[PDB]
């Protein structure tokens, strides 16, 4: 589990969005596994605006933050998980590391701020849904 809290936006994995998220929906995209809802209180996170390929992510199933190198966001085939069938996911970055389903929502961060959230795992990789292209998260 986990979210990004930037201004009055909550960014969550679409597959973990709650009824309150859907009832307060700003934007969602199944192909990216992202959903954005509105918040009362302003959030503590800053979104990265950059093309970094190194950062640190939180792994809840290890209670650990790991430094990783990761691929640039792209359209990738993802094998079946507990929460999605085998399918193509867009805006996905991969790193070598540990990721189980419950790790979804952990933040990947670089020197510029939050890059994305854990969205995929299995076969010794961790996949992250990028948010750095969502420039509208920083305004209105
Ligand atoms: C995102 C703001 N921010 C953070 N934040 C964290 C969590 O590390 N570290 C910074 C270092 C220098 C300048 C700004 C910085
Ligand atoms: Zn960066």
PDB file of C-alpha atoms and ligand atoms in Angstrom:
ATOM      1  CA  UNK A   1       0.000   0.000   0.000  1.00  0.00           C
ATOM      2  CA  UNK A   2       0.978   3.638  -0.326  1.00  0.00           C
ATOM      3  CA  UNK A   3       0.178   6.946  -1.996  1.00  0.00           C
ATOM      4  CA  UNK A   4       1.749  10.177  -3.165  1.00  0.00           C
ATOM      5  CA  UNK A   5       0.311  13.309  -1.496  1.00  0.00           C
ATOM      6  CA  UNK A   6       1.140  16.335  -3.724  1.00  0.00           C
ATOM      7  CA  UNK A   7      -0.868  19.532  -3.107  1.00  0.00           C
ATOM      8  CA  UNK A   8      -4.565  18.471  -2.963  1.00  0.00           C
ATOM      9  CA  UNK A   9      -4.009  15.228  -4.977  1.00  0.00           C
ATOM     10  CA  UNK A  10      -3.695  11.651  -3.769  1.00  0.00           C
ATOM     11  CA  UNK A  11      -1.953   9.363  -6.298  1.00  0.00           C
ATOM     12  CA  UNK A  12      -2.577   5.659  -5.768  1.00  0.00           C
ATOM     13  CA  UNK A  13      -2.317   2.458  -7.675  1.00  0.00           C
ATOM     14  CA  UNK A  14      -5.608   2.175  -9.596  1.00  0.00           C
ATOM     15  CA  UNK A  15      -6.034  -1.427  -8.329  1.00  0.00           C
ATOM     16  CA  UNK A  16      -5.902  -0.175  -4.710  1.00  0.00           C
ATOM     17  CA  UNK A  17      -8.169   2.875  -5.152  1.00  0.00           C
ATOM     18  CA  UNK A  18     -11.010   3.063  -2.603  1.00  0.00           C
ATOM     19  CA  UNK A  19     -14.661   4.000  -3.085  1.00  0.00           C
ATOM     20  CA  UNK A  20     -13.786   7.477  -1.664  1.00  0.00           C
ATOM     21  CA  UNK A  21     -11.043   7.784  -4.348  1.00  0.00           C
ATOM     22  CA  UNK A  22     -13.530   6.903  -7.149  1.00  0.00           C
ATOM     23  CA  UNK A  23     -16.141   9.280  -5.597  1.00  0.00           C
ATOM     24  CA  UNK A  24     -13.509  12.121  -5.647  1.00  0.00           C
ATOM     25  CA  UNK A  25     -11.852  11.102  -8.944  1.00  0.00           C
ATOM     26  CA  UNK A  26      -9.514  13.509 -10.769  1.00  0.00           C
ATOM     27  CA  UNK A  27      -7.964  11.139 -13.335  1.00  0.00           C
ATOM     28  CA  UNK A  28      -7.400   7.411 -13.827  1.00  0.00           C
ATOM     29  CA  UNK A  29      -5.633   5.154 -16.379  1.00  0.00           C
ATOM     30  CA  UNK A  30      -5.830   1.290 -16.122  1.00  0.00           C
ATOM     31  CA  UNK A  31      -2.968   0.896 -18.637  1.00  0.00           C
ATOM     32  CA  UNK A  32      -0.697   2.834 -16.168  1.00  0.00           C
ATOM     33  CA  UNK A  33      -2.253   1.364 -12.953  1.00  0.00           C
ATOM     34  CA  UNK A  34      -2.750   4.954 -11.684  1.00  0.00           C
ATOM     35  CA  UNK A  35      -5.647   6.833 -10.129  1.00  0.00           C
ATOM     36  CA  UNK A  36      -5.644  10.354  -8.756  1.00  0.00           C
ATOM     37  CA  UNK A  37      -8.301  11.637  -6.278  1.00  0.00           C
ATOM     38  CA  UNK A  38      -8.784  15.032  -4.403  1.00  0.00           C
ATOM     39  CA  UNK A  39      -7.701  15.671  -0.728  1.00  0.00           C
ATOM     40  CA  UNK A  40      -8.884  18.180   1.928  1.00  0.00           C
ATOM     41  CA  UNK A  41      -5.390  18.717   3.482  1.00  0.00           C
ATOM     42  CA  UNK A  42      -2.273  19.624   1.340  1.00  0.00           C
ATOM     43  CA  UNK A  43       0.395  16.874   1.035  1.00  0.00           C
ATOM     44  CA  UNK A  44       4.101  16.709   1.936  1.00  0.00           C
ATOM     45  CA  UNK A  45       5.429  15.263  -1.443  1.00  0.00           C
ATOM     46  CA  UNK A  46       7.168  17.003  -4.405  1.00  0.00           C
ATOM     47  CA  UNK A  47       7.115  15.343  -7.839  1.00  0.00           C
ATOM     48  CA  UNK A  48      10.412  14.933  -9.672  1.00  0.00           C
ATOM     49  CA  UNK A  49      10.649  16.665 -13.087  1.00  0.00           C
ATOM     50  CA  UNK A  50      13.642  14.967 -14.644  1.00  0.00           C
ATOM     51  CA  UNK A  51      14.907  11.907 -16.577  1.00  0.00           C
ATOM     52  CA  UNK A  52      16.855  10.338 -13.668  1.00  0.00           C
ATOM     53  CA  UNK A  53      17.442   6.580 -13.866  1.00  0.00           C
ATOM     54  CA  UNK A  54      18.765   6.219 -10.318  1.00  0.00           C
ATOM     55  CA  UNK A  55      16.831   6.576  -7.114  1.00  0.00           C
ATOM     56  CA  UNK A  56      15.689   4.851  -3.914  1.00  0.00           C
ATOM     57  CA  UNK A  57      12.429   2.924  -3.390  1.00  0.00           C
ATOM     58  CA  UNK A  58      10.580   1.666  -0.358  1.00  0.00           C
ATOM     59  CA  UNK A  59       9.932  -2.080  -0.114  1.00  0.00           C
ATOM     60  CA  UNK A  60       7.294  -2.824   2.548  1.00  0.00           C
ATOM     61  CA  UNK A  61       7.880  -6.601   2.385  1.00  0.00           C
ATOM     62  CA  UNK A  62      11.508  -5.941   3.585  1.00  0.00           C
ATOM     63  CA  UNK A  63      10.843  -2.843   5.706  1.00  0.00           C
ATOM     64  CA  UNK A  64      13.751  -1.340   3.692  1.00  0.00           C
ATOM     65  CA  UNK A  65      14.583   1.398   1.243  1.00  0.00           C
ATOM     66  CA  UNK A  66      16.848   0.206  -1.620  1.00  0.00           C
ATOM     67  CA  UNK A  67      18.948   2.244  -4.059  1.00  0.00           C
ATOM     68  CA  UNK A  68      18.188   1.174  -7.645  1.00  0.00           C
ATOM     69  CA  UNK A  69      18.900   1.936 -11.261  1.00  0.00           C
ATOM     70  CA  UNK A  70      15.704   1.817 -13.365  1.00  0.00           C
ATOM     71  CA  UNK A  71      14.679   1.885 -17.010  1.00  0.00           C
ATOM     72  CA  UNK A  72      12.953   4.950 -18.568  1.00  0.00           C
ATOM     73  CA  UNK A  73       9.135   4.705 -18.612  1.00  0.00           C
ATOM     74  CA  UNK A  74       7.889   2.444 -21.452  1.00  0.00           C
ATOM     75  CA  UNK A  75       5.205  -0.016 -22.601  1.00  0.00           C
ATOM     76  CA  UNK A  76       6.135  -3.392 -21.037  1.00  0.00           C
ATOM     77  CA  UNK A  77       4.523  -6.830 -20.897  1.00  0.00           C
ATOM     78  CA  UNK A  78       3.788  -7.756 -17.254  1.00  0.00           C
ATOM     79  CA  UNK A  79       3.073 -11.373 -16.234  1.00  0.00           C
ATOM     80  CA  UNK A  80      -0.062 -12.172 -14.171  1.00  0.00           C
ATOM     81  CA  UNK A  81      -0.123 -10.994 -10.550  1.00  0.00           C
ATOM     82  CA  UNK A  82      -2.629 -11.425  -7.723  1.00  0.00           C
ATOM     83  CA  UNK A  83      -4.320  -8.140  -8.853  1.00  0.00           C
ATOM     84  CA  UNK A  84      -3.980  -8.110 -12.695  1.00  0.00           C
ATOM     85  CA  UNK A  85      -3.879 -10.626 -15.551  1.00  0.00           C
ATOM     86  CA  UNK A  86      -0.802 -10.826 -17.798  1.00  0.00           C
ATOM     87  CA  UNK A  87      -1.037  -7.601 -19.883  1.00  0.00           C
ATOM     88  CA  UNK A  88       0.873  -4.600 -21.317  1.00  0.00           C
ATOM     89  CA  UNK A  89       1.345  -1.734 -18.834  1.00  0.00           C
ATOM     90  CA  UNK A  90       2.408   1.759 -20.045  1.00  0.00           C
ATOM     91  CA  UNK A  91       4.681   4.364 -18.401  1.00  0.00           C
ATOM     92  CA  UNK A  92       6.383   1.531 -16.483  1.00  0.00           C
ATOM     93  CA  UNK A  93      10.033   1.584 -15.211  1.00  0.00           C
ATOM     94  CA  UNK A  94      11.842  -1.601 -14.159  1.00  0.00           C
ATOM     95  CA  UNK A  95      14.639  -2.198 -11.661  1.00  0.00           C
ATOM     96  CA  UNK A  96      16.305  -5.281 -10.204  1.00  0.00           C
ATOM     97  CA  UNK A  97      14.833  -5.704  -6.749  1.00  0.00           C
ATOM     98  CA  UNK A  98      12.209  -7.276  -4.556  1.00  0.00           C
ATOM     99  CA  UNK A  99       8.491  -6.543  -5.065  1.00  0.00           C
ATOM    100  CA  UNK A 100       5.429  -8.491  -3.885  1.00  0.00           C
ATOM    101  CA  UNK A 101       1.824  -7.346  -4.451  1.00  0.00           C
ATOM    102  CA  UNK A 102       1.551  -5.605  -1.094  1.00  0.00           C
ATOM    103  CA  UNK A 103       4.644  -3.492  -1.970  1.00  0.00           C
ATOM    104  CA  UNK A 104       2.506  -1.541  -4.464  1.00  0.00           C
ATOM    105  CA  UNK A 105       2.362   2.141  -3.523  1.00  0.00           C
ATOM    106  CA  UNK A 106       5.927   2.355  -2.165  1.00  0.00           C
ATOM    107  CA  UNK A 107       7.632   5.554  -3.378  1.00  0.00           C
ATOM    108  CA  UNK A 108      10.589   5.651  -5.766  1.00  0.00           C
ATOM    109  CA  UNK A 109      12.453   8.961  -5.287  1.00  0.00           C
ATOM    110  CA  UNK A 110      15.416  10.685  -6.911  1.00  0.00           C
ATOM    111  CA  UNK A 111      17.299  13.857  -6.072  1.00  0.00           C
ATOM    112  CA  UNK A 112      14.412  15.856  -7.638  1.00  0.00           C
ATOM    113  CA  UNK A 113      11.526  14.262  -5.601  1.00  0.00           C
ATOM    114  CA  UNK A 114       9.012  11.477  -6.149  1.00  0.00           C
ATOM    115  CA  UNK A 115       9.452   9.582  -9.463  1.00  0.00           C
ATOM    116  CA  UNK A 116       6.648   7.020  -9.113  1.00  0.00           C
ATOM    117  CA  UNK A 117       5.158   4.209  -7.070  1.00  0.00           C
ATOM    118  CA  UNK A 118       5.682   0.444  -7.015  1.00  0.00           C
ATOM    119  CA  UNK A 119       3.198  -1.195  -9.393  1.00  0.00           C
ATOM    120  CA  UNK A 120       4.670  -4.575 -10.501  1.00  0.00           C
ATOM    121  CA  UNK A 121       6.863  -7.342  -9.148  1.00  0.00           C
ATOM    122  CA  UNK A 122       7.969 -10.935  -9.673  1.00  0.00           C
ATOM    123  CA  UNK A 123      11.023 -12.620 -11.274  1.00  0.00           C
ATOM    124  CA  UNK A 124      13.462 -10.450  -9.307  1.00  0.00           C
ATOM    125  CA  UNK A 125      12.247  -7.129 -10.764  1.00  0.00           C
ATOM    126  CA  UNK A 126      10.287  -4.228  -9.277  1.00  0.00           C
ATOM    127  CA  UNK A 127       8.205  -2.091 -11.663  1.00  0.00           C
ATOM    128  CA  UNK A 128       7.247   1.525 -10.931  1.00  0.00           C
ATOM    129  CA  UNK A 129       4.419   3.603 -12.405  1.00  0.00           C
ATOM    130  CA  UNK A 130       6.014   6.889 -13.465  1.00  0.00           C
ATOM    131  CA  UNK A 131       4.317  10.162 -12.484  1.00  0.00           C
ATOM    132  CA  UNK A 132       6.985  12.650 -13.697  1.00  0.00           C
ATOM    133  CA  UNK A 133       5.093  13.312 -16.961  1.00  0.00           C
ATOM    134  CA  UNK A 134       1.923  14.376 -15.012  1.00  0.00           C
ATOM    135  CA  UNK A 135       2.826  18.076 -14.894  1.00  0.00           C
ATOM    136  CA  UNK A 136      -0.741  19.049 -13.907  1.00  0.00           C
ATOM    137  CA  UNK A 137      -0.097  17.409 -10.458  1.00  0.00           C
ATOM    138  CA  UNK A 138       1.983  20.603  -9.642  1.00  0.00           C
ATOM    139  CA  UNK A 139      -0.884  23.134 -10.339  1.00  0.00           C
ATOM    140  CA  UNK A 140      -4.653  23.791  -9.707  1.00  0.00           C
TER     141      UNK A 140
HETATM  142  C1  LIG B   1      11.540  17.089  -1.826  1.00  0.00           C
HETATM  143  C2  LIG B   1      12.217  18.181  -1.028  1.00  0.00           C
HETATM  144  N1  LIG B   1      13.564  17.787  -0.593  1.00  0.00           N
HETATM  145  C3  LIG B   1      13.909  16.626   0.048  1.00  0.00           C
HETATM  146  N2  LIG B   1      12.934  15.756   0.503  1.00  0.00           N
HETATM  147  C4  LIG B   1      13.241  14.493   0.913  1.00  0.00           C
HETATM  148  C5  LIG B   1      12.091  13.649   1.374  1.00  0.00           C
HETATM  149  O1  LIG B   1      14.397  14.076   0.902  1.00  0.00           O
HETATM  150  N3  LIG B   1      15.207  16.488   0.215  1.00  0.00           N
HETATM  151  C6  LIG B   1      15.756  17.653  -0.332  1.00  0.00           C
HETATM  152  C7  LIG B   1      17.087  18.065  -0.407  1.00  0.00           C
HETATM  153  C8  LIG B   1      17.364  19.314  -0.953  1.00  0.00           C
HETATM  154  C9  LIG B   1      16.343  20.124  -1.449  1.00  0.00           C
HETATM  155  C10 LIG B   1      15.017  19.717  -1.395  1.00  0.00           C
HETATM  156  C11 LIG B   1      14.749  18.476  -0.826  1.00  0.00           C
HETATM  157 ZN1  LIG B   2      15.464  13.138 -10.803  1.00  0.00          ZN
END
